[PDB]
Amino acid sequence: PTSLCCKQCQETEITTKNEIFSLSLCGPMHETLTVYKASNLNLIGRPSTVHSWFPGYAWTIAQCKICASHIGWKFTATKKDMSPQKFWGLTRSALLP
Ligand SMILES: O=C1CC[C@H](N2C(=O)c3ccccc3C2=O)C(=O)N1
Ligand SMILES: [Zn+2]
């Protein structure tokens, strides 16, 4: 009901609408849903900064633990002074609803 599940298998809650936050800037200074917390995702490989959509963070591929759908990435901060130190960037179209 606040629940966002893997679209492919519909078994797993991946996150909730409660966890949604926005790193995008609201002044003169979408497709990716960023959430503080998520569940039921397996991380693949190791963090990389190449082409990172969120400068300062590295990414690790995250897939649904049940059906292996590529749902998004775990983003991890490269510096200790950043907040959050970690979040999830989730492909909206890989989630239901
Ligand atoms: O922060 C991110 C997550 C990974 C994402 N990524 C991809 O989605 C992709 C597809 C094919 C070749 C290379 C990449 C790449 O780095 C990307 O470009 N930046
Ligand atoms: Zn799944």
Residue numbers in the entry: 321 to 349, 360 to 427
Provide passages from the article that reported this PDB entry.
Thalidomide directly binds cereblon (CRBN), which was originally reported as a cerebral protein associated with mild mental retardation. CRBN is a highly conserved protein that forms a CRL4-type E3 ubiquitin ligase complex, CRL4CRBN, with Cul4A and damaged DNA binding protein 1 (DDB1), and plays a key role in limb outgrowth and expression of fibroblast growth factor Fgf8 in zebrafish and chicks. CRBN TBD consists of eight β-strands (β1-β8) with a single zinc ion, which is coordinated by four conserved cysteine residues from two CXXC motifs located in the β1-β2 and β5-β6 loops. The central β-sheet (β4-β5-β6-β7-β3) contains the tri-Trp pocket formed by Trp383 (β4-β5 loop), Trp389 (β5-strand) and Trp403 (β6-strand).
All of these relatively small but significant differences in the binding mode between (S)- and (R)-thalidomide molecules suggest that the (S)-thalidomide bound state of the thalidomide-CRBN complex is more stable than the (R)-thalidomide bound state. As with the previous structures, our structure of thalidomide-bound CRBN TBD prepared with racemic thalidomide revealed that the bound thalidomide molecules are all (S)-enantiomers. This is also consistent with the notion that CRBN preferentially binds the (S)-enantiomer. We found that the binding affinity of CRBN to the (S)-enantiomer was ~10-fold stronger than that to the (R)-enantiomer.
